[PDB]
Enzyme design. Structure first.
Site, short mmCIF file in Angstrom:
data_model
loop_
_atom_site.label_atom_id
_atom_site.label_comp_id
_atom_site.label_asym_id
_atom_site.label_seq_id
_atom_site.Cartn_x
_atom_site.Cartn_y
_atom_site.Cartn_z
N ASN A 126 41.84 38.29 41.56
CA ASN A 126 40.45 38.87 42.07
C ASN A 126 40.22 38.56 43.39
O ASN A 126 40.48 37.40 43.79
CB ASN A 126 39.52 38.25 41.09
CG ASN A 126 39.76 38.75 39.73
OD1 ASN A 126 40.77 39.55 39.39
ND2 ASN A 126 38.94 38.21 38.68
N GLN A 138 28.94 41.41 29.12
CA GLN A 138 28.32 42.13 30.34
C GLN A 138 28.07 43.58 30.28
O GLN A 138 26.97 44.16 30.65
CB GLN A 138 28.98 41.91 31.76
CG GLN A 138 29.14 40.55 32.29
CD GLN A 138 29.90 40.76 33.48
OE1 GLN A 138 31.00 40.49 33.46
NE2 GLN A 138 29.38 40.66 34.67
N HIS A 174 36.56 36.11 28.63
CA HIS A 174 36.00 36.33 29.58
C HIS A 174 34.53 35.79 29.43
O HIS A 174 33.40 36.13 29.74
CB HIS A 174 35.68 37.99 29.79
CG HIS A 174 35.33 38.18 31.24
ND1 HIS A 174 36.14 39.30 32.20
CD2 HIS A 174 34.24 38.02 32.06
CE1 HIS A 174 35.54 39.40 33.17
NE2 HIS A 174 34.52 38.56 33.25
N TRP A 219 25.42 38.20 35.04
CA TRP A 219 25.24 36.64 34.91
C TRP A 219 24.29 36.00 35.26
O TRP A 219 23.05 36.54 34.88
CB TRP A 219 26.61 35.68 35.52
CG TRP A 219 28.02 36.45 34.88
CD1 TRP A 219 28.70 37.17 35.74
CD2 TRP A 219 28.47 36.76 33.66
NE1 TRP A 219 29.90 37.33 35.06
CE2 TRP A 219 29.77 37.23 33.88
CE3 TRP A 219 28.16 36.27 32.30
CZ2 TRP A 219 30.55 37.38 32.53
CZ3 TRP A 219 28.79 36.48 31.43
CH2 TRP A 219 30.01 37.02 31.50
N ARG A 244 40.46 47.66 32.21
CA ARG A 244 40.39 46.22 31.90
C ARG A 244 39.32 46.00 31.36
O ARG A 244 38.23 46.16 31.75
CB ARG A 244 40.50 45.29 33.38
CG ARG A 244 40.55 44.07 32.95
CD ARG A 244 40.88 43.22 34.29
NE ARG A 244 40.65 41.68 33.82
CZ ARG A 244 39.78 40.97 34.21
NH1 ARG A 244 38.89 41.16 35.33
NH2 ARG A 244 39.82 39.60 33.99
N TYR A 293 37.08 39.30 46.44
CA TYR A 293 35.79 39.75 47.00
C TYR A 293 35.43 39.57 48.49
O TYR A 293 35.08 40.50 49.22
CB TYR A 293 34.86 39.09 46.05
CG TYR A 293 34.65 39.83 44.63
CD1 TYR A 293 35.30 39.00 43.43
CD2 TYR A 293 34.08 41.16 44.34
CE1 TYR A 293 34.97 39.70 42.39
CE2 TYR A 293 33.98 41.60 43.22
CZ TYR A 293 34.46 40.83 42.30
OH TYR A 293 34.38 41.37 40.72
#
Ligand SMILES: *[C@H]1O[C@H](CO)[C@@H](O)[C@H](O)[C@H]1F
Ligand SMILES: [Zn+2]
Length: 478
Positions: free
Chosen positions: A312, A21, A125, A442, A79, A314
């Protein structure tokens, strides 16, 4: 008002990134292609803006600016992920070790430490080696385990003297469901009737096979780390898992049970094997022989295979009961028998961000953390990803694009929600914001911006602090 000082002493604040990314330099420095290089070039129609990670945010060249940017804010930790194919261009040891790739990550790690920023490294990842995809279908084959283990070991050997925080896999849920169930992410596999309209795949088997192999590769790697590396390097190793909070569609027990099945399938899928040594009961019952079985020995290995869990969060979904299918369209997506929505009676669960799947619901953050506390023995947790996005708008002037008040609002409410959870006993040790910079999102490409810092893709990837960068600077004082 809430600040770092409100949080426990020694609490770690950071930002999060990933290799594909951020980095770019995709065919530079001896880097081999990953499945995301292939997916983006061979299936540009699967990306919202037909884009790729060839250049991304150009962190392969600009990493020193990244470190400067996070230090300016007063971040404790970073991270980031290592690209498997930067280290092993064709995935395996026998294919050769890329010294130039090792040099880059050494340079990044050394730059971080010279500025007092602790590196947290994700090994995987999603940028899985294309060569292993061609050779044996990557994570669909048990061959992936040893190759991952060999890759992980090079990382421990080369970097483990300075790196004391390791994460094996980032959100296996997302990798397996989007890569093998819906086929919307790389490697783009699914059943013909599923969303991705894929040429190859099986949405009712492949997600479970791929993720079974990730759990096995993780547990094997943890064991290896503790056996050969932990004694002299004294670092910690964990895994990063994602969960939404699931609100029952109605107050009926049926919809309460659907919410329970929703979290079991998304989160328990990995947590139950890690805590209890086997998959959730709901998964074993509903999926049956399409779900792989741990041997007694494998069950022993996966159980307790962690020092911490990366968590995680969201958003939240409503969970509604689904009647059985009950037939020839078996897919991980429907296997839970829970219908997931972000809207009920024309009312969205929370304000919708640029990502259509992202609804702002800070209350579910606390709810998830307390659920993990009460149901999984309150394990050591780091929040490894939390954040929000706005649209990439080419018509807006730069100064208006930097005014990300919605992001400030998002972080303010979620950090308060996190604080209350900690004060109610949640075993949380740190927090990482997604993301430091705008990056390749993505299947959404560069149409959405998650960063605390703006990246001008049309002006040489120049970085500009957004209003939220200044907000974090104030927050992180002391
Ligand atoms: C966590 O979620 C963000 C936002 O969708 C992704 O960009 C990261 O790669 C993922 F790890
Ligand atoms: Zn450059």
């Amino acid at each position: 008002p809430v600040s770092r000082r409100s949080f426990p002493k020694g609490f770690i604040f950071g930002t999060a990134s990933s290799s594909y990314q951020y980095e770019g330099g995709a065919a530079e420095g001896g880097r081999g292609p990953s499945i995301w290089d292939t997916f983006t070039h061979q299936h540009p129609e699967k990306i919202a803006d037909r884009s790729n990670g060839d250049v991304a945010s150009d962190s392969y060249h600009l990493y020193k600016e990244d470190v400067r940017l996070m230090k300016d804010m007063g971040m404790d930790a970073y991270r980031f992920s290592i690209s498997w194919t930067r280290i092993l261009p064709n995935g395996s040891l026998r294919g050769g070790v890329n010294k130039e790739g090792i040099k880059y990550y050494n340079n990044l790690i050394n730059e971080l430490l010279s500025k007092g920023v602790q590196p947290f490294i994700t090994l995987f990842h999603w940028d899985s080696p294309q060569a292993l995809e061609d050779k044996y279908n990557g994570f669909l084959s048990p061959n992936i385990i040893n190759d991952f283990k060999d890759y992980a070991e090079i990382c421990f050997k080369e970097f483990g003297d300075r790196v004391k925080n390791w994460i094996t896999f980032n959100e296996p849920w997302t990798f397996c469901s989007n890569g093998y169930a819906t086929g919307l992410f790389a490697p783009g596999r699914c059943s013909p009737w599923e969303k991705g309209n894929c040429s190859v795949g099986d949405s009712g088997r492949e997600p479970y096979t791929a993720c079974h192999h990730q759990l096995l590769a993780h547990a094997e790697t943890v064991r290896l780390y503790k056996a050969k590396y932990q004694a002299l390097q004294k670092g910690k190793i964990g895994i990063t898992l994602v969960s939404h909070w699931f609100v029952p569609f109605s107050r009926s027990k049926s919809n309460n049970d659907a919410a329970k099945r929703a979290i079991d399938f998304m989160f328990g899928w990995f947590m139950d094997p890690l805590i209890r040594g086997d998959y959730p009961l709901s998964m074993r019952g509903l999926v049956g022989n399409r779900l792989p079985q741990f041997t007694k020995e494998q069950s022993k290995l996966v159980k307790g295979a962690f020092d911490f869990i990366g968590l995680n969060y969201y958003t939240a979904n409503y969970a509604d009961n689904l009647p059985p299918s009950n037939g020839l369209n078996n897919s991980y997506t429907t296997d839970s028998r829970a219908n997931l929505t972000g809207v009920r009676n024309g009312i969205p669960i929370g304000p919708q961000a640029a990502s259509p799947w992202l609804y702002v619901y800070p209350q579910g953050f606390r709810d998830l953390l307390l659920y993990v506390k009460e149901n999984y023995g309150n394990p050591t947790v780091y929040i490894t990803e939390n954040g929000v996005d706005e649209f990439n708008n080419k018509t807006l002037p730069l100064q208006e694009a930097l005014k990300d008040d919605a992001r400030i609002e998002y972080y303010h409410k979620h950090l308060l929600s996190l604080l209350s959870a900690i004060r109610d006993g949640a075993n949380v040790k740190g927090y990482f914001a997604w993301s430091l910079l705008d990056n390749f999102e993505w299947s959404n490409g560069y149409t959405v911006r998650f960063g605390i810092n703006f990246v001008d893709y049309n002006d040489g990837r120049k970085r500009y602090p957004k209003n939220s960068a200044h907000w974090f600077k104030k927050f992180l004082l002391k």
